Design a protein around this ligand. Sequence first.
Ligand SMILES: O=C(Nc1ccnc(NC(=O)[C@H]2C[C@H]2F)c1)c1c(Cl)cccc1Cl
Length: 288
Amino acid sequence: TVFHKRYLKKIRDLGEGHFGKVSLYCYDPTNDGTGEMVAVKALKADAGPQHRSGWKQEIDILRTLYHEHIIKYKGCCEDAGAASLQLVMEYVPLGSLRDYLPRHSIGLAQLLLFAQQICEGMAYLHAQHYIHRNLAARNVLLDNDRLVKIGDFGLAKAVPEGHEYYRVREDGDSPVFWYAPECLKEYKFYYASDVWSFGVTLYELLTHCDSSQSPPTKFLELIGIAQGQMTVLRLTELLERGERLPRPDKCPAEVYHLMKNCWETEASFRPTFENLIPILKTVHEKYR
Ligand SMILES: O=C(Nc1ccnc(NC(=O)[C@H]2C[C@H]2F)c1)c1c(Cl)cccc1Cl
């Protein structure tokens, strides 16, 4: 599907993704105003060949994905400036859980329904042989009080049929506070590594995305802020010692133990996303 830049009317910027900025546009070819609202992700004009090859890969990944709990790909727009493609996706009206939750006190049952929906979208992604590599409350978009969607595939990679992991590189933009120890130490990203990040995302939802309770805040309190180039090493060490993010207030102990199971140091001891679906359906049922 192809969108024309001449019909895209910019409303406002939505935020910064991984390779570039996301903006809210009205695609109005009739010029009346009845045009559909679209979220357009664009690659920065000054970006090198390293980001350009990754951006094209992000587009191809989202184009091949079709799930009710994954952001709907709408099409691409020919960006004459920057000589690249603009990723046109659906506008998810309520936005990110990182932005929504601190302003809207959402009940425990709805938060568990969101976690269940995340696992549903993630089991699909894993069945398609892809790893997300950036599962966080910031990347989970809210369509309505009962529907959630995974939104940023900038770090998403395809795991080859024979392999069970993807070898990652030393990057400053890596979401380390959402990463399993094997990612930090051995630079390997398994399907089980996305389950660690889910556990962290579940923690964020149960804290209502309170920035003072956030994973970078809580981990840096244990590490310290004057550790030179050793923040990640110190993070790897505390996780190896069995230290974890604390139990959020009003979080049921059962739910916290499920979180701790998503955070097993041993990747094989962790549940798959397919294992978490009937578990979270039952837990949501208990609290509804
Ligand atoms: O693409 C993003 N957000 C996005 C996409 C589609 N619709 C929305 N909706 C809204 O932002 C709602 C609040 C009103 F603007 C957000 C996005 C951004 Cl930018 C930054 C990081 C991660 C993601 Cl997923």
